[PDB]
């Protein structure tokens, strides 16, 4: 497993993560695609 | 609904809004050099 | 003489039904998605597709499009709380 | 046969690509005489 790591200054790293702990500033995403997927068979020959 | 909705930013305020001003601040200083964006929701209603 | 058939091909895409008035994109939330009628009572729901017959099982793809969020918290070091929202259709 | 290391260096150097991900430059910033555009890795298989 490989990460890279940008070289922060340790100071602004530091404040960073502080305000990053607070909830009011939770990370949030969606995904791109954002549906349910449902698949639905239908026979050979089958048209309804 | 408008309770999960805003708690999960399906709607309600943008993330310049409701990030703390802090945050919002050190955001646009550092966005050449280290971009936090696609990191924090903004609802479209 | 001659016979005329027309046709069309468009792979690679989806078909697409927007859930909104006017059928135009007016915001992620749509505004049918935001009416009372679909808030305050719950509804079933039944779809009818007519396809061009195969002659080989097939499948209906069906997306429900929908919201699929999460909102992540790390309050301590090597802590990660994840709060996860699917709607409608919640898991 | 290129380096991981060498690879960041150029991303970075080049389009300020690396820390946050790898990914194709916008195309207004990957010129003609830009790294990525001309990059080209390739393997074959000889006789043993």
Redesign the interface.
């Known amino acids: 497993l490989?990460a890279?790591?940008?070289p922060?200054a340790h100071n602004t790293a530091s404040?960073?993560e502080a305000?990053?702990?607070?909830?009011?500033?939770?990370?949030?995403?969606?995904?791109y695609?954002?549906?349910?997927?449902?698949?639905?068979?239908?026979?050979?020959?089958?048209?309804? | 609904m408008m309770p999960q909705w805003s708690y999960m930013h399906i709607s309600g305020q943008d993330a310049s809004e409701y990030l703390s001003p802090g945050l919002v601040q050190f955001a646009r200083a550092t966005e050449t050099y280290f971009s936090l964006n696609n990191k924090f929701r903004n609802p479209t209603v | 003489d001659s016979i005329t058939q027309k046709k069309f091909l468009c792979d690679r895409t989806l078909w697409r039904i927007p859930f909104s008035s006017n059928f135009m994109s007016m915001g992620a939330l749509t505004d049918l998605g935001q009416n009372l009628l679909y808030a305050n009572s719950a509804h079933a729901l039944d779809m009818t597709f007519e396809v061009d017959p195969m002659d080989e099982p097939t499948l209906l793809y069906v997306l429900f499009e929908v919201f699929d969020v999460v909102r992540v918290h790390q309050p301590h070091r090597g802590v990660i709380e994840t709060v996860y929202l699917r709607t409608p259709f919640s898991a | 046969n290129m380096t991981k290391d060498w690879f960041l260096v150029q991303m970075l150097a080049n389009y300020n690509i690396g820390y946050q991900g790898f990914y194709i430059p916008e195309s207004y910033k990957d010129r003609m005489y830009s790294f990525f555009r001309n990059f080209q890795p390739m393997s074959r298989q000889v006789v043993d």
């Open positions: 490989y890279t790591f940008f922060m404040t960073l305000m990053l702990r607070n909830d009011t500033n939770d990370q949030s995403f969606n995904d695609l954002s549906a349910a997927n449902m698949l639905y068979p239908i026979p050979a020959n089958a048209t309804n």
